[PDB]
């Protein structure tokens, strides 16, 4: 019970730090699952953009709840010589917004 | 069964050529004198012959065989050609001395100087009480076609091929009237379907 937890008030207090400027607490953090479950997805699919930009960037298409939700760049291109920087992640702001179209 | 039907009675062109070029069957084995019979000794080496078959490098590590023309030769590929020299460690059917193409002969039957009895070890009669055994003789004497050769040290010796030794070991009758060879698959001899049925319990007809 979250209500009953309030009674463990002072009991959840750990050591203070920085000469009393701070307090370490030992309290529940389960609420953090809220953002974790948003990031979680069904799968990622490799795709790119059929637009005339010259980018030719490979992306990870995220499917969640059986729908396309967002995309982030693939970074697994075959690496260039050791004396050259690699291509990853490529991408651009336009491409990062493509997912918007599907159900817009 | 395979040797009897696909190598002897109805020779397979594919199988015959294969064992001729890819096995040590045509290779010559020296026979050792025993009391009343012979035993298969070490393989004949180029070094054992007078001119060492023209082999200067590792002659004691190169095996010998007869070509289809009755001539003795040291074919390419033997371990002796691997070190101390180059270009001859291959399976090309060639004469290791003349570098000329040659054809190895498998059996000496039909060109032997005489027939000699060679003893073969047989353990099928031994074993614990938990397994079936077939009593024959600890040593099985087989009739093998041989040829007498004059060695480099002046001595003489009888030789036969791995091929002939193998057919005898399997118990294949070849016309020399060998009592220890099978007269049929039902003949309980050292290595038949009838024999195996007793040892393994597997029906001879299935084995066949």
């Amino acid at each position: 019970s979250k209500f009953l937890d309030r009674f463990r008030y002072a009991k959840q207090k750990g050591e203070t730090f920085a000469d009393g400027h701070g307090q370490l607490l030992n309290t529940n953090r389960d609420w953090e699952d809220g953002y974790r479950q948003r990031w979680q997805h069904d799968k990622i699919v490799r795709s790119t953009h059929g637009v005339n930009c010259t980018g030719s960037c490979s992306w990870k298409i995220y499917v969640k709840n059986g729908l396309v939700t967002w995309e982030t760049q693939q970074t697994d291109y075959p690496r260039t010589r050791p004396d050259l920087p690699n291509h990853e992640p490529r991408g651009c702001p336009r491409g990062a917004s493509y997912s918007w179209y599907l159900y817009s | 069964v395979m040797l009897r039907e696909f190598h002897l009675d109805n020779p397979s062109q594919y199988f015959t050529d294969y064992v001729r070029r890819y096995t040590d069957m045509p290779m010559l084995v020296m026979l050792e004198e025993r009391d009343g019979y012979y035993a298969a000794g070490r393989m004949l080496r180029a070094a054992d012959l007078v001119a060492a078959l023209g082999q200067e490098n590792n002659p004691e590590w190169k095996t010998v065989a007869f070509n289809t023309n009755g001539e003795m030769v040291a074919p390419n590929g033997s371990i002796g050609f691997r070190w101390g020299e180059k270009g001859k460690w291959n399976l090309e059917q060639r004469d290791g001395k003349t570098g000329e193409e040659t054809e190895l002969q498998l059996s000496l039957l039909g060109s032997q100087d005489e027939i000699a009895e060679v003893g073969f070890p047989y353990f099928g009669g031994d074993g614990t009480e938990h397994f079936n055994k077939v009593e024959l003789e600890n040593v099985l004497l087989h009739k093998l076609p041989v040829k007498r050769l004059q060695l480099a040290d002046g001595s003489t010796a009888l030789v036969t091929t791995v091929y002939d030794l193998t057919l005898a070991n399997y118990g294949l009758e070849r016309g020399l009237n060998d009592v220890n060879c099978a007269t049929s698959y039902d003949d309980v001899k050292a290595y038949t379907p009838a024999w195996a049925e007793q040892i393994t319990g597997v029906s001879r007809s299935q084995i066949i």
């Binding site: 699952d33 979680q40 967002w70 918007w100 | -």
Partner: protein, 509 residues
Amino acid sequence: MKIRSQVGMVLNLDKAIGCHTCSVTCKNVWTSREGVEYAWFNNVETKPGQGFPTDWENQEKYKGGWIRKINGKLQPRMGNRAMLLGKIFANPHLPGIDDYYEPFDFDYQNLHTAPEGSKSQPIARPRSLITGERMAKIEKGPNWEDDLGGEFDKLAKDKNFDNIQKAMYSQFENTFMMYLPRLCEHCLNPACVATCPSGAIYKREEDGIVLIDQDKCRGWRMCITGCPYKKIYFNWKSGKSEKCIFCYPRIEAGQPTVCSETCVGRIRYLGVLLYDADAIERAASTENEKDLYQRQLDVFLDPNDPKVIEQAIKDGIPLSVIEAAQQSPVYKMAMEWKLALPLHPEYRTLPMVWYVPPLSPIQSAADAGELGSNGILPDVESLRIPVQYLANLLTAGDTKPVLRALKRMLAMRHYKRAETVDGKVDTRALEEVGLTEAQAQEMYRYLAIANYEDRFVVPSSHRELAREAFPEKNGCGFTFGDGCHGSDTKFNLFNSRRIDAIDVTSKTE
């Protein structure tokens, strides 16, 4: 002495291309909900400019950050505890929606459903996402000033132009612009945490990520004013505040944040920094604000020092975290090469997202110029971006550390050119800035080649420690609604039990 760890971030503004890819990916993942559609956890601003929200750097106006009282004690600029509570019925400094922008959408469907016989070509007009009403015109956006969009006199109101004769910069030939991408600084002495009456904001012990507890937040909306970087955004629908979460779901397993991995310019670096939590208040309360930068560096600890390593282990820092700290690109840039600098250290929050200042085209001159100390390449004195502007942004007005960073970058360039073009060893520039060939080569490795494994060195947050990962692995995610999550006491009115826990106790000990 209490050692704690955190994955800090460094953004190389010299490589910044102001593309906003970082902003779009964050938005798609974290803030596409009604209530936070106007909120950009990560936002990029073109400077000179006033930013998002407008004039966020003006603390006299917004009251963010800390002040050091005459007695030497720290107090939120917003006011002490009583002063702050006295403002709770109506936060007098609160930024309004118009300080950000009124979120909008367009009537695209009109393009599809326009009736036959229309007198003119149908069009999609703007509509407010706040009222749902037609908008006569869009007058503002989160990136309205992009690429010097607006009259100079307007952009130049930029707080960072303080103490600078800016007239000369209104001249075409002297034009300059740079990009400032930013997110929450996940400070060591966060002003937000200190200004929340409910105590819903906290810094995570294991990785230093600062979060607003969505259960515990009561919507007092005071924290928004408290943050001098204005990186906390009120969710107008839920009635609670939200902020950059440093992508903790990813960081927890050793992955880069979304804005870091998706940074197209490859300017973001992630690396562990070990800090002495017991020194936070001492550092943040130093008398001279120009000393805050160095005071913070002094709170960072040497990860290769056995004394620190042994203390770290004693204080609970995982071995893999200590290891990551020993190959941290952030530590190298901030502590070793002195290329990275904090963003507005004078706010006294001890920010953990630092920046390498940008180089720029040489300034306008009488002629084509002459070869300088760096040959055909620029000398720090010739750069067109006024160093004082950069100092106001990163070092509380002290140009010394900014000049050092810029000069060192140029020195590396001089050294590498001698090597790759002349095929000769020339360390003249490096010696002038106190760099060794080895340091210049490592700088080059990380800044130029910048392999993926070198840009991000993120260790696991080790969720198995001090918790029960086994039952969690087996039952997390089955969101049927057991009503038992979020509390340590097992009793619950609905007479239920946690789905991801074991209720049948072992009787065999």
